[PDB]
Design a protein around this ligand. Structure first.
Ligand code: NDP
Length: 468
């Protein structure tokens, strides 16, 4: 089954370090002024009890890489740095990726590289991930740290220690495992600490939709980025599924290239299609769009494919840059979320990416926005609302023209999927109500060699094909 070999999901399996062998040297604890004091004290005593001197580094919000580079050069020799920037962090207004902890995490990493400390950075987050459906993601933006983090580990393994999540407001777990985590031979760099043990992030193959639950499109289905490559294939699938009415949105709208043939193609499949110009980053524009939907054909589902790729190295990335470039995906999602929350939707699908599922060099700026969607989908489900964040691999029938990039991808273990097949995996994911399904064609032989090129990983320990 070509549709069952593309299905994966993220699970958190119990695990441990493996003899911490205590510590040795001085450790720096990065934190904002008068913030995460309780957690800092916990980390200090924990690290010190392991035989290591602990000094703190008070960071000024959005200070920049330069300031931190000068300061890290006078600190002397450092064994490692523990970041608490994302701990006890407020969740005010502005854009979600405007988070100070994201901007400063990048600055600390860049600063450590320039100062040439030669030590790894370990970042702590609070309820940024969920080990199970019963746990709620506190702020979906904190997941962006995990998304960019996975890329940084691939681009500069020496400076990146790993990511550790703990229950918000709790310091017990950290004080008990931090020592082993930072000095373990397991190689775990993506962990979640809970009152009931330590868990590691793992990829696992998904089963099959052995349920009578079959998602069907009704009323009006809205597709953002509907006139784009992937959006257009989704629209075709919906039409073939029997969708009565389709609303395709993009900034270009009717002026989109190929829009005419798309509409004709969709209606030729038996679906009244409408194409409108609408910038999903404009709150009022979206509202007016939703208020324009007929009463006889109420909105039943949203497919958010709107986005823009960036491409760039971590050394050239900044919190500001990332927030700016991913507005359509992030603000579009947040806007659609808050404006349709009261509607009786049967499906709310966010288009994530392999960029956040495992990450890859070059996509450090793209990974953050995709990770935000993953968390936002989990939060909706925790609140009793429908949501699916699909982490897509590459697509074959889309606008991927290729020159240097596609060829490198395929010999790296990632093959583009036929559009029709990708959509059928989505259908199966909906039928089983999977919150964050991963749909990608990966050839593990070639993949593992390219992924573990210069850094070991346990992410795929439960993958049979990756096991062999
Ligand atoms: N193709 C690939 O290699 C990969 C794709 N994927 C997945 O596929 C998804 C779909 O995107 P894809 O088709 O590949 O990309 P495309 O860039 O081909 O873009 C669709 C386009 O979407 C629309 N859009 C952009 N900004 C806005 C906005 N503010 N409001 C409304 N619509 C907007 C626009 O339509 P218009 O011009 O009409 O304004 C835009 O031109 C991704 O988001 C990702 O989840 C993941 C990995 C790789």
């Amino acid at each position: 089954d070509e549709v069952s070999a593309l299905r994966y999901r993220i699970e958190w399996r119990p695990t441990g370090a493996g003899e911490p062998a205590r510590l040795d040297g001085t450790w720096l604890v990065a934190k904002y002024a008068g913030t995460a004091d309780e957690t800092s004290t916990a980390a200090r005593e924990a690290l010190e009890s392991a035989g290591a001197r602990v000094r703190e580094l008070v960071v000024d919000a959005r200070c920049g890489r330069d300031e931190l580079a000068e300061r890290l050069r006078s600190v002397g020799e450092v064994a490692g740095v523990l970041s608490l920037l994302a701990v006890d962090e407020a969740e005010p207004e502005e854009a979600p990726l405007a988070l100070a902890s994201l901007a400063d995490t990048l600055s600390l990493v860049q600063a450590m590289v320039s100062a040439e400390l030669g030590c790894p950075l370990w970042t702590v987050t609070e309820s940024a991930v969920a080990t199970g459906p019963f746990e709620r993601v506190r702020n979906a933006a904190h997941g962006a740290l995990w998304g960019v983090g996975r890329v940084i580990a691939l681009e500069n393994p020496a400076v990146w220690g790993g990511l550790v999540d703990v229950p918000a407001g709790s310091v017990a777990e950290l004080a008990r495992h931090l020592a082993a985590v930072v000095s373990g031979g397991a190689g775990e760099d993506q962990l979640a600490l809970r009152a009931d043990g330590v868990y590691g992030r793992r990829w696992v193959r998904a089963a099959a939709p052995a349920t009578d639950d079959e998602w069907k499109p009704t009323g009006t289905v809205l597709v953002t980025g509907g006139t784009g490559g992937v959006g257009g294939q989704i629209a075709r699938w919906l039409a073939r599924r029997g969708a009565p009415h389709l609303l395709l949105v993009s900034r270009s709208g009717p002026d989109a290239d190929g829009a005419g043939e798309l509409v004709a193609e969709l209606e030729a499949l038996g679906a009244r299609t409408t194409v409108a110009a609408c910038d999903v980053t404009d709150r009022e524009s979206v509202r007016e769009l939703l208020g324009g939907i007929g009463d006889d054909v109420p909105l039943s589902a949203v497919f958010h494919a709107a986005a823009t790729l960036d491409d760039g190295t971590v050394d050239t990335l900044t919190g500001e840059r990332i927030e700016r470039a991913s507005r359509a995906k992030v603000l579009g999602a947040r806007n659609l979320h808050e404006l349709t929350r009261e509607l009786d939707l049967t499906a709310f699908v966010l288009f994530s990416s392999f960029a956040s599922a495992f990450g890859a060099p070059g996509l450090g700026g793209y990974a953050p926005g995709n990770a935000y969607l993953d968390g936002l989908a989990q939060q909706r489900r925790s609140d009793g609302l429908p949501a699916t964040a699909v982490a897509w691999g590459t697509w074959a029938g889309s606008g991927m023209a290729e020159g240097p990039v596609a060829d490198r991808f395929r010999r790296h273990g990632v093959i583009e999927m036929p559009p029709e097949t990708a959509c059928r995996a989505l259908q199966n994911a909906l039928d089983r109500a999977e919150v964050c399904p991963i749909v990608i064609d990966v050839r593990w032989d070639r993949f593992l060699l390219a992924y573990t090129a210069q850094r070991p990983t346990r992410l795929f320990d439960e993958i049979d094909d990756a096991r062999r």
